[PDB]
Amino acid sequence: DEANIETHGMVPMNRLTDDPRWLPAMSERVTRMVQRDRNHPSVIIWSLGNESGHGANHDALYRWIKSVDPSRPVQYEGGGADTTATDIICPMYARVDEDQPFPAVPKWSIKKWLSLPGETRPLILCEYAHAMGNSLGGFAKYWQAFRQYPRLQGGFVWDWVDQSLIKYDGNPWSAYGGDFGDTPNDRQFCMNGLVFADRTPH
Amino acid sequence: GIFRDVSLLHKPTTQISDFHVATRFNDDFSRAVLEAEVQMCGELRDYLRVTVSLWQGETQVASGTAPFGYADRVTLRLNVENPKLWSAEIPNLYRAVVELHTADGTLIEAEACDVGFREVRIENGLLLLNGKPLLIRGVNRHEHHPLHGQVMDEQTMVQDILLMKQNNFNAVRCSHYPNHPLWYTLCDRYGLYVVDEANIETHGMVPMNRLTDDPRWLPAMSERVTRMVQRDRNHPSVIIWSLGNESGHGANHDALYRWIKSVDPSRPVQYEGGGADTTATDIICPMYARVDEDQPFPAVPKWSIKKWLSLPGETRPLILCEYAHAMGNSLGGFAKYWQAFRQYPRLQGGFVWDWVDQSLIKYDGNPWSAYGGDFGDTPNDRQFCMNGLVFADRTPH
Prior knowledge:
This is part of a larger assembly, with two copies of chain A. Helices cover 21% and strands 12% of the residues of chain A. With 202 residues, the first copy, chain A, is of the alpha/beta class. The longest helix of chain A is centred in the first third of the chain and has 15 residues, at 23-37. At the A-B interface, helix 3 of A face helix 5 of B.
């Protein structure tokens, strides 16, 4: 389960999740989810958001969740995905062997991330293997690493269903952002499904 | 035979017995203090005095004096400022002189030992030398001479150190025994991290640790380890004590590791046996662990080095006990190996086996290099004794 928190476009990323005036809203959006969905046994890992920037509100909410329901590990990908606000190290698009050392949010090779000093938490890939049409490449490489390394425990192929809206010319044709006259948009970046919108297998 | 020098030493009735010179530093290494703990023997007179003087070359920097009182042991602490630290790049040397002198000042006996200022400690999975991570580009220097067997002399030792430093080798592992006493002195003088290795090897015994678990061999193993430690503690070049090469992990190795960590806590202790990951080892040192290929042997597996790094609950650093066999036109995968060493922070290099070719000169009268089995010896191991980066006469391979 993933709490509805996303402030990617804000500059910097954690300009909001460190201001303690947004603790009420973030706490509502996290605690209501936890309370509503605690009983179900399928839900195993609570996630406080996708790269929303690591401030202090995320530490507070992580500790609140670990105090309320200690039967589930809490993952959170922001702030380099290795902060104290995360039990399950979940980076985004960390490549297998190639290293991507970005400032303050680097993308280590996953094996190097495993071999980081003082690091003992398991690693699952928050997002990996973008399925953009004829894509899902390096999957094997990825699965080879997953099977070799015990503390690397797989990832989440992004994403399942294609976010295509039906447009009529009257022949239906799948459309993306910007085909409705919307601006600004992000063209075909909304088309990353393992199956089509009507569930025809890719 | 008698393969090392025989000497005759004369001492007065009262003499200096033992002294250990340790060092500690502050956070920025600007301020440090020297512990020249000293012991003596014989009749104890109130007028007896000891003096520890620190000379940076011809100039004296720090000194101290104290009478006895253990009634035969006296502790001196000498403060040093902005010390010239010691590392393989810069072999800074301090000539500390210990004096056994009379109350009026007449000198009875004086002893000295070269002392370097360095720190070796383990934290967060990294081997820190003077606050910095290390890159061990080692080598296993076997003691062998083309025309004298295992008789070693200063010319050969100096020339080997020269060749070793000319090729960016800044680490040596005496394989598998403590070396000649002057070797360590030359190592301090030139700058070369040494990994001393206690003379313990029982590879052929079935099983490997049938001897190193029987507590009837604890006396012999303790002698062979503790005498080395006591003799070679003072030298600053020796950084890592090694209890042996894959001798099988019993209980004697745990006992001796704890004894070493109790006596000289300034040096990490490595030991390769029993999978090289037991409690009897601070520096995980497997043999021939390949970079990516995995070799899962029963009870002594050879993981890929990266997998060994990523083992659960494992935080100790990894240096390769032996790797890159240099059998003639060999040293392959070196790069692969060095790529892994440079990528992975907690992987800290290895020891290229081995330095000098163990070839004995045979005359047909033309000298021709020979191996095991060419002298009529049986059983032998043919050309497996030929794994040198240089020939026996030091012609570069």
